[PDB]
Amino acid sequence: AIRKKLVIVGDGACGKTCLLIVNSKDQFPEVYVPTVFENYVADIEVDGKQVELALWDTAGQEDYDRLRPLSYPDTDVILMCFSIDSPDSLENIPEKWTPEVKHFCPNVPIILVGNKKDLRNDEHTRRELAKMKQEPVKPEEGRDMANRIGAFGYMECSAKTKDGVREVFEMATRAALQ
Amino acid sequence: GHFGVCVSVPIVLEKLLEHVEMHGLYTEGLYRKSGAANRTRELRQALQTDPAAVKLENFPIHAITGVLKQWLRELPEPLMTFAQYGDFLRAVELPEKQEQLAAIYAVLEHLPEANHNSLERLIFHLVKVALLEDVNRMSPGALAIIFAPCLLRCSDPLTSMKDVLKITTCVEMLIKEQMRKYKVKMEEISQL
Numbered sequence: 001a002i003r004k005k006l007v008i009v010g011d012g013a014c015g016k017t018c019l020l021i022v023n024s025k026d027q028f029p030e031v032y033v034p035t036v037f038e039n040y041v042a043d044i045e046v047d048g049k050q051v052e053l054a055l056w057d058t059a060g061q062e063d064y065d066r067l068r069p070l071s072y073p074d075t076d077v078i079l080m081c082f083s084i085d086s087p088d089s090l091e092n093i094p095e096k097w098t099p100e101v102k103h104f105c106p107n108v109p110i111i112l113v114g115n116k117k118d119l120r121n122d123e124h125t126r127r128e129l130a131k132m133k134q135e136p137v138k139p140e141e142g143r144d145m146a147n148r149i150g151a152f153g154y155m156e157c158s159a160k161t162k163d164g165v166r167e168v169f170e171m172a173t174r175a176a177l178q
Numbered sequence: 179g180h181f182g183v184c185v186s187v188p189i190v191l192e193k194l195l196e197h198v199e200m201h202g203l204y205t206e207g208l209y210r211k212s213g214a215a216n217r218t219r220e221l222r223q224a225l226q227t228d229p230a231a232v233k234l235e236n237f238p239i240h241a242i243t244g245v246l247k248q249w250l251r252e253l254p255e256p257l258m259t260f261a262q263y264g265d266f267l268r269a270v271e272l273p274e275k276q277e278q279l280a281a282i283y284a285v286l287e288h289l290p291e292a293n294h295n296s297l298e299r300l301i302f303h304l305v306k307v308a309l310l311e312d313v314n315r316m317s318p319g320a321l322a323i324i325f326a327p328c329l330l331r332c333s334d335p336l337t338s339m340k341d342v343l344k345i346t347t348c349v350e351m352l353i354k355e356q357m358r359k360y361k362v363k364m365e366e367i368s369q370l
């Protein structure tokens with residue numbers, strides 16, 4: 001069996017921990033607490049291959065910028081996340097996450113991931129974003145961004161409805177195997 | 179500046195705090211979510227130009243919180259001091275609740291009063307945030323996680339992770355102790 005290390009990063013509260021737990025445990029956490037550092041393991045099957053995925057959870061807050069790179073050594077694939085309901089977090093993808101990840105993880109494949117897919121047409125969400133002349137990220141913006149930053153690929157998912165959660169981790173696994 | 183200078187309470191701090199108290203306490207994930215980097219950067223630049231002439235209503239609330247935490251992290255020496263760092267850590271290493279608490283408050287009277295001024299204002303702020311946990315979802319614990327690296331700094335940074343959890347416990351206990359002492363003071367006011 002093949003062992004690959006995945007690290008997940010992105011703005012605070014954009015759903016990294018739910019994404020990881022729903023894939024590994026098929027369960028959806030309810031506690032509202034920010035992650036500092038955690039580890040999970042998920043087993044995955046792609047293209048007839050058997051992979052043990054080490055999932056490294058991190059903090060999205062700038063406050064942990066000095067500590068976060070402790071997670072980066074020997075990474076085989078990156079999940080770089082933003083939230084569909086937050087245009088600000090997409091903005092921070094080329095401005096903050098891409099430079100940090102390309103610097104500590106050069107030559108490591110990056111899967112750009114738009115989280116919380118269930119919210120793109122959710123009514124309370126669009127109401128709130130419209131208050132600030134914003135709207136949910138459109139797939140196009142997400143896909144475009146993945147090209148700007150040179151991601152291995154673009155996936156959207158919703159951890160809560162599990163929509164796409166699976167495909168995220170096969171893309172990531174296939175990225176890692178090469 | 180304005181920013182990254184030696185620390186009643188600095189007007190930039192107060193201005194930022196008072197606006198968030200007036201406007202932000204119902205925002206889900208206050209201090210947990212970050213602002214847009216560029217909008218945050220512009221707000222920081224503005225508060226170097228004309229600190230009082232800044233209409234904060236023109237900025238997003240997570241940019242405003244972003245700049246607040248950026249201010250704390252850019253202080254020459256952290257709010258809680260370099261000197262007392264080791265003593266806060268040990269206060270936390272004590273075996274049971276009430277003496278950890280008693281030690282932490284014992285460390286606090288050792289602070290230079292300018293640090294003590296800004297720090298107590300900030301802790302009061304965080305109390306107000308947590309009292310409204312039912313709306314904004316921020317527990318004392320969540321706030322401690324976020325603010326602990328802002329308030330105290332060692333450098334390894336290997337087992338700085340082990341240390342970060344302790345300064346988190348320290349700040350979490352301050353928030354909680356101030357919060358219950360709030361509950362009791364409100365009670366005592368109606369008494370005798």
Ligand SMILES: Nc1nc2c(ncn2[C@@H]2O[C@H](COP(=O)(O)OP(=O)(O)O)[C@@H](O)[C@H]2O)c(=O)[nH]1
Pocket residue numbers: 010011012013014015016017018019029030032033034035060115116117118119157158159160161
């Ligand atoms: N609607 C929706 N909410 C989500 C999803 N994933 C996470 N959340 C919520 O977003 C908040 C933070 O999620 P979390 O995984 O802890 O964010 P992290 O800080 O990036 O690790 C919590 O309120 C979650 O319940 C999702 O797929 N859809």
Ligand SMILES: [Mg+2]
Pocket residue numbers: 016017033034035057058
């Ligand atoms: Mg997390």
